[PDB]
Amino acid sequence: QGVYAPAQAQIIHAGQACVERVYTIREGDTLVLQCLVTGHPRPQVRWTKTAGSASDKFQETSVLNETLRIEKIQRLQGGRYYCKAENGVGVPAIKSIRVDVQYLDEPVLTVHQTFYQEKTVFLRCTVNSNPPARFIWKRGAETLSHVDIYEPLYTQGETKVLKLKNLRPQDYASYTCQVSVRNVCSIPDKSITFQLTNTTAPPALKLSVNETLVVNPGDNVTMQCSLTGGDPQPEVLWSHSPGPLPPNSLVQGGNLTIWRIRVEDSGYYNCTAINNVGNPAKKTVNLLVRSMKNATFQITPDVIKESETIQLGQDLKLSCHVDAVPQEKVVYSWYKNGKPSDRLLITRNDPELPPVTCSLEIIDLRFSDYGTYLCVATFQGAPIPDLSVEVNISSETVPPTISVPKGQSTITVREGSRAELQCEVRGKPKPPIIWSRVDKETPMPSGTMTVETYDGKLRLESVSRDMSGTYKCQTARYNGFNIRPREALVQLNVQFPPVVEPAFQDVRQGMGRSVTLRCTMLKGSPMKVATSVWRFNGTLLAQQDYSELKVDSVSRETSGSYECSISNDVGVSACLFQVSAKAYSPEFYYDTPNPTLSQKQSKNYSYILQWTQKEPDAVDPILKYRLEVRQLAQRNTIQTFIPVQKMEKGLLLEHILPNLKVPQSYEVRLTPITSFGAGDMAARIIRY
């Protein structure tokens, strides 16, 4: 390639700046970076940014523009930017620049008090700033070692501390930290002052409730957090964990009220006081709302005899459980066709089973034990309602077995629609089913690894292909037999339309020569070409995992747009080819001094129009170019023909436009002509 030149970039500075490779500006101002580029064909330019995805100044910022513009810049918008410029010839051009937004926040001033001879106070001054700040202390007059000043570890220049080793009376004054950023980017210094007095003292709090507070749902609880010391007067603030305070909870300020408290409102409520003196005071109260949920039973046949079924002459455990907030306060009552138990039937409150689970055992099972057992969980004198779990034991009760009904082992559905997976469980009682995925360890529509279901149905509203795989269904260990869970698998096909290749392809070839088009299917379920249909300019044609078409003679009559419509049994997708013997667009040459002043008079200049032909040998040879010249101002165009002598990839072509009015601009449209006719036209604007 003779004239084709690799891209070349250069960054230039604009907009508001201050004062080599870095572009420093004040926060809030406007950034303007321009990337000048050269090379042929004219390379494209995009400004991008390079930042750690997961921290601090990060934005995804890909703009296709020779000018980067950030108005009212911010701290985070800062960082390193690079301008990339490419044109196909050679290696892309890259230039780097660091934008260094600068600032100086208001300084924070805090103070801390502290053998037994001298009292010592530490005045700590902190500020966030770019560049690193400079600190100056003063007590009306500037202070030096004459007391001590220094920067501690675990600070990157953002902090200085003023140490008053011996607190003499003159020291009881107004201390002010004056922090400066060296006035770079014309940024003013800033100051903060504090009134150090012998009454100065950190905050202190008193709470109107105990360490831990238990309450019933609906109850109104109000908590008074009051100051008991602090100078300056500290600010009191309530907070909640987990999550925010509201709804139904209002902060008057100091006073915290919770109306109609719900069970989910339980947790820690912390009152904190701050006055920038010493450590902030904090009082913490843990509010526990009572509740009982998820009462469950378990049938545990003889474990030592290795049984999974109720058999006469065996031990039979009937457990009981409920989830409660004051878990230690629950009490269970076992009834059996009424409420009874010493001999043969015994109570056990805490086995290896879940926490706080009451379970009676029946030694030497007997037909007389066949009955309806009931467990009643309750709170000692609590207004909340009791909870119960009934569990009928009889000859009929039997461990469960699970299976897939008929042939729904593999069930296929189209993407988007709803899907329903099915397992059917048998036994008395029937435990709920727990669905999980096996092919991989991923979560589910519900967002967790498993879902509970009693009907043995798993419903999928908006089924996604991601869900396509293998699913496990198994019996619960609760609300039934506490036995090795029975398992069964089901396949889930999520069908979706095909995707073919290429989606679009601009095909060029001589007039007498032939060409073959292939449309290939990569993904698609079913992964089979149900049918492939080649179409030409709307009309259908005549006719394997893919489809092929051969254009015998690329002529004006056969040249056009071919469409291969590959389709599975669910949807259709098509490749689209553009066949022709059109020459490619000419490539305007932009890097030359063009205009020629006619004696600076007659209002005439001339322009040296230059360009190259992209891939001259891709089609029939270029005979002549049609040159059009319009002035923007008027519709009429001057049409001319440049005749090509011959050309090779990279040869520069030239043409002078003799009569052009000195101040106006012109549009230039340049079209190649081959035996096939007009190729792809290109356009450009020239100017004096």
Binding site: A51, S55, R80, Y82, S96
Partner: protein
């Protein structure tokens, strides 16, 4: 059979290779593949240009000439090179005896086969000892490729003067060797698909200065989209010998040596371009101790700024990263000061530190307190009189400073800025009769395991009598390395299948917990590798500089 592949530059013929191992399948080798144009004539001290195409079938059955170098004990630095290299120069010499300035060639190893189907991952090995010598030809990727079912590529880039000379201005911007590596990666991205490789899963890895190269590439915008993951073994961009900070100084010393030292930097470079490459290579240019003369430079383009500044300010893309160090990197640092009793005297200890402080910490005021503080920290106060314990701690000092501290700094910053990071410590090796019996895993000792050398038994380059445990550990390392390449997770998709790594999942590294994998015959995950000594160099010592 006859491996022929048509690339964008022409047809290429490969060569089938059987491995000396019944479980490993054979591989296809493409040796001496041009990935750039010869950097000769006006192309010397200039960026690489794409290679010229050919119309026939080009043979790739043998290694191409290596880049100009002089390792025949031509005053090379032993403290920077891997012990396996320096202890076997006669064999190493045979790999670089055939030289030419036209040396921009790469080698491709393709497996002949597993489980998941589709384009296979590509692992590009970047060699490097001191930037002055070496060749990818020394690293046979056959076993790694065959065992892991991945494509392995070794690259040859311009070395020393020819690859890194810089005048500090536009006359010679330097980093030519890095540009060749970038160009090699470009070639790979554009042509590896023809070999069955996945350009969307390219992992770059290297040991020593090769590891330094890997990290420097991750800080360059030129690497965008080129590769997705990086593995850096015993090498960072933050060490004292990773970058040449005074290129102009050394460029003029060379010029003076060859009669090219003129005022104009442009005329100086043109003068060098007229000189025979051998004349430039054979010159004696000694750099400051623990530093380099000719190597990567901060040009503001390839390398936008000091790696330290770029990393601290998170000015780098988020690649998947795996990095680590060996228990006893600095063997050669003390090996030369050890007495006939395998111990180090208190006076020798003081001397080493004194030399150490002066060379790395050239501060005029305060070097005294520094030397004394460093001695105290690296003194074992329990058994303080033992000359052998003194040897170990001194070795640790150099190891901690040159390898451990920089690696942790890199890992901390990468993870902190969102890059998935994995950290390891190599506490195993195979002792030859050429290394002291008291030595632990030294610099480069992990290479044979990563390359699967134990599986094909002792080689001319790696003569150690590998044990069954060496084979087992080698398999494990290769499993982890290729797993990272395949998914970005050392634990996926191949499980560790007695194998002591069966239940050992390699947790991701974070600055808060700093979990790392202890690689040895008793592997397991630990936390905060040498936290105390590492923090000394990274936090306290810098403070003693007086800001």
């Amino acid at each position: 059979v006859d491996p022929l592949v048509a690339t964008n530059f022409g047809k290429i013929r490969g060569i089938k290779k059987e491995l000396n191992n019944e479980i490993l399948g054979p591989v296809i080798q493409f040796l001496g593949v041009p990935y750039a144009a010869p950097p000769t004539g006006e192309r010397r001290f200039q960026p690489p240009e794409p290679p010229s195409p050919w119309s026939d079938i080009r043979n790739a059955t043998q290694f191409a000439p290596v880049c100009p170098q002089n390792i025949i004990d031509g005053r090379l630095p032993e403290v920077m090179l891997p012990v396996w290299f320096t202890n076997n120069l006669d064999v190493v010499s045979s790999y670089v005896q055939d030289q030419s300035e036209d040396c921009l060639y790469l080698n491709i190893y393709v497996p002949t086969e597993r489980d998941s189907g589709g384009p296979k991952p590509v692992m590009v090995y970047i060699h490097g000892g001191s930037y002055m010598e070496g060749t990818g030809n020394l690293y046979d990727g056959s076993v790694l490729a065959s065992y892991g079912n991945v494509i392995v590529i070794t690259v040859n880039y311009r070395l020393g003067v020819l690859g890194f000379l810089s005048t500090g201005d536009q006359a010679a911007k330097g980093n030519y060797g890095l540009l060749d590596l970038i160009q090699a990666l470009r070639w790979t991205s554009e042509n590896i698909g023809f070999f069955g490789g996945d350009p969307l899963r390219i992992t770059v890895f290297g040991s020593g200065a090769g590891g330094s190269c890997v990290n420097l590439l991750t800080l360059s915008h030129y690497s965008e989209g080129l590769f997705q993951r990086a593995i850096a073994q015993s090498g960072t961009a933050l060490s004292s010998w990773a970058v040449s900070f005074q290129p102009a100084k050394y460029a003029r010393m060379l010029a003076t040596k060859v009669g090219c030292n003129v005022s104009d930097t442009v005329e100086l470079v043109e003068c060098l371009q007229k000189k025979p490459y051998k004349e430039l290579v054979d010159q004696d240019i000694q750099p400051a101790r623990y530093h380099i003369a000719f190597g990567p430079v901060i040009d503001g383009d390839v390398i936008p700024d000091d790696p330290q500044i770029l990393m601290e300010q998170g000015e780098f893309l988020n690649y998947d990263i795996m990095l680590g160090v060996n228990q006893g990197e600095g063997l050669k640092f003390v090996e030369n000061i050890v007495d006939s009793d395998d111990g180090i005297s208190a006076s020798d200890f003081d001397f080493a530190v004194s030399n150490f402080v002066d060379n790395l910490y050239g501060y005029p005021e305060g070097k005294d307190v520094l030397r004394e503080t460093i001695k105290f920290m690296y003194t074992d106060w329990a058994d303080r009189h033992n000359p052998e314990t003194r040897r170990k701690t001194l070795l640790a000092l150099f190891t901690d400073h040159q390898w451990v501290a920089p690696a942790v700094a890199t890992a901390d910053l990468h993870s902190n800025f969102g890059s998935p990071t994995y950290f390891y410590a190599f506490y195993h090796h195979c002792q030859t009769d050429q290394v002291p019996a008291w030595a632990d895993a030294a610099h480069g000792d992990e290479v044979p395991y990563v390359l699967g050398i134990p599986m094909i038994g002792p080689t001319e380059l790696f003569p150690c009598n590998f044990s069954k445990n060496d084979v087992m550990l080698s398999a494990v390392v290769m499993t982890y390395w290729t797993n990272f390449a395949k998914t970005g997770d050392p634990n996926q998709p191949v499980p560790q299948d007695p194998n002591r790594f069966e239940e050992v999942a390699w947790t991701r590294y974070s600055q808060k917990d700093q979990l790392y994998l202890h690689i040895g015959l008793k592997p397991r995950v630990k936390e905060h590798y040498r936290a105390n000594k590492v923090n000394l160099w990274l936090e306290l010592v810098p403070h003693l500089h007086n800001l």
